[PDB]
Amino acid sequence: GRLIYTAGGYFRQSLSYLEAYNPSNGSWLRLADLQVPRSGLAGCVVGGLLYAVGGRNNSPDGNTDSSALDCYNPMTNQWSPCASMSVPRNRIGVGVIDGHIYAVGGSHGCIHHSSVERYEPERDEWHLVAPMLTRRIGVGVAVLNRLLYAVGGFDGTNRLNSAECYYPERNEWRMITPMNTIRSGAGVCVLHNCIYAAGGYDGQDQLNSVERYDVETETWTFVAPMRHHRSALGITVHQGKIYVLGGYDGHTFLDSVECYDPDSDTWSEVTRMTSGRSGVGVAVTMEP
Template identity: 60%
Template sequence: MALSHAFFNQNSRMLCPRKKKQPCLKNCTAIAVPSMKGHGYLDYTIENHTSKAFEKMDEMRRNNLLCDVLLRVSYNGKEEDFHVHKIVLASCSPFFRAMFTNNFRECHAREVTIKDICPKVMQRLIEFAYTSRITVGEKCVLHVLLAAMRYQMEDVAKACSDFLVKHLDASNVIGISNFAEQIGCHELYRTGREYINTHFSEVTNEEEFLSLSHCELLDLVSQDSLNVLCESEVYNACLKWMQWDLNNRAQYFHALLNAVHLYSLPAKFLEIQLKKCPILSKENRCRVYLSKIFQEMCLHKPLPRPKQRGNQLIYVAGGYLQNSLSSMDAFNPQTGEWIKLADMLEPRSGLGACIVSGLFYAVGGRNNSCQENTDSDLLSFFNPVTNQWASRAPMNVPRNRVGVAEIDGAIYAAGGSCGSEHHKSVEKYDPDNDRWTFVAPMPTARIGAGVVACRGRLYVVGGFDGDTRWNTVDCYDPEEDQWQPVASMETIRSGAGVVALDNYLYAVGGYDGTNQLDSVERYNIERNYWEAMAPMKHRRSAHGLTVHQGKIYALGGFNAGGFLSSVECYCPDRNEWTEVTVMPTGCSGMGVAVTMEPCPQLCDKNEEN
């Protein structure tokens, strides 16, 4: 019976009598439909319907069934044909969608010729369109990525990018980054550049780096985002690149020097280069340029504020809270986050801290814990690249509440105490020889003094000699090995924080023998006088004080209310303090300094442990 007859008859309730349970269409002109009033609606989904449908379409493709276009793919004289369905390619590629829907010639063509793509690569893209699966390896991933970008198949491009990111290393990252930039794969390019910035020193040891053009190298070393321990790493990388082909590359030395942050180099490093660098003996213009900067450093003239590479963090080591602490944390002012790092080798409070060649040095202090209570002569350093501590030669005498600063790569440890003895002695540490030597002692014994270096000289501010708290300030000249007094502060301060910023010294907080202080005063080095500045939000002594990107940060400390966890930031332009964060643990007597951001993978690993 033809199905064109009326299939349903609203007036009929009769079923075909041939079978009691099943309707039969033979010899029937109508089927009765029972009423379903009041039973709602059915919403039913077959979860694997789409995948099963695409499986059938892929099967039809492989058997050339219902295919409406033939892709003739040619590459290097080789040609291969692929029968496909336009709608499938158009559904996952804006390129093919435009080709088949926008009245181009190919829109109605039964055959389309595609050149300059390997047929095997095209086969992978076609199979992905039907199956959502893509398989790539080291030999083909770049070819597949190039094709995916060309035909705008974002999911394939992301899969290839993820594969390449997973296999980035120092030997291939430059090539992969350049390739990503050329084909417009921005995310892969960004990730590659981040890898170069983070692993710059490793990358410079590879042949890809040495094969860079001078323009590519100049672009690379001009990046402030390079994460290096010391600017000397950038300078040495430029030397290494030139020495690879000295006859042809020496001409670019001056241009490269303009990209190096020369005022961030230690004067001692520049002196060695001027004496021993063979390239400078040939490139007189570069020699004159570096000599001028070196002379400015030696004459202690006001210098431009050194530029910092990469993201710099504030590191906080040790401290005191009922007991001496061994913790090491870093604060990122850009994100407001604290990072937990490897603990010190032993608990210490009252220690000094400074940065030499990007390494965080912890000097002296006291181990006041349940097991012992001893003053320390220890010297150790933390490497943010490896997230590890290492010991170095101890000082000649233990020094608790010691003042520490760095001048031209040497560490100076001034004053401090051992038991009841308050030191006026000062020691100098040479990292190259791992050795401490005494220099001229201070005129007055001091513990809890603020010690800071500025323009090649060492300043010791305030402090306590066991009987008297001081407002006096003494200045040490390393070249003359002599001390001389300069203008005294307006306020007596021990346990104050002292930093140098833009040719000023800032003395912040402290203890005057009666109260913790919130007051701040600033020393004008050129004119030899102190002036009052805006006070902090909190009174504090034995706190951490450091400079980060032109602003002063005061961390923790102690006052009549107990141990502080608050962190304040001072803006010299506005002469104003603002509270910015709280420390993971409130404490006093910690070592604080600023250096490069640690490797993220190492930080994550430490937090897991």
């Protein structure tokens, strides 16, 4: 009874869609729209609630970066505003550790953040923690073994192959081995002891390559590439498989959803989104 939710995104303008995909039967459900359109946001889940964090509304009337945190309850199909972050964060990355949401990086106009802040749902409060060693927008974030990783991105001048890890009990960030490819706008997730980085943009092309970091060995290794090159894709893990959703391939706003099986090292097309889009926020929780 778990669905893949996709929130927001962009196609002509930033979007307010909330749609949920059921891998068990291939269906899509359109649910309550976000109150404000946004692309470049991130999604996450804590205690059965879905959260939409940051992003920017790129509308016909202008660009507004978002510091918003909005809460969706599948039991009522209703969005509720939660406490806003200290600063707007477009092209943010988020990770959940021990019931708390970490918001990492992102931009506010020409400001590229290294700052990081943590949300406690029990108090509806954000607090700043140690900043990253590098400013990162279009950064991929994932959590493995209660450690937070920030991968790739763009620092205001260069696209990055670097990555770093936050150790919460020391409130400290440390660099990890850099990836073998420069990636800004990649999808980053965790699956079976590894941090995966899929797609993104290297400065010249949108990528179909995928590499994974084994935290025990400190190495990055390429796996099978996706069928579609994509940047600003959504990504999540569900029942031991990675799912990538949409993105931009330099020509089209993809509706493709591919699924990676780690046992066979293969990607397959599993469904199409209802319309092509980039910059979505994705997470997995109960059916509404």
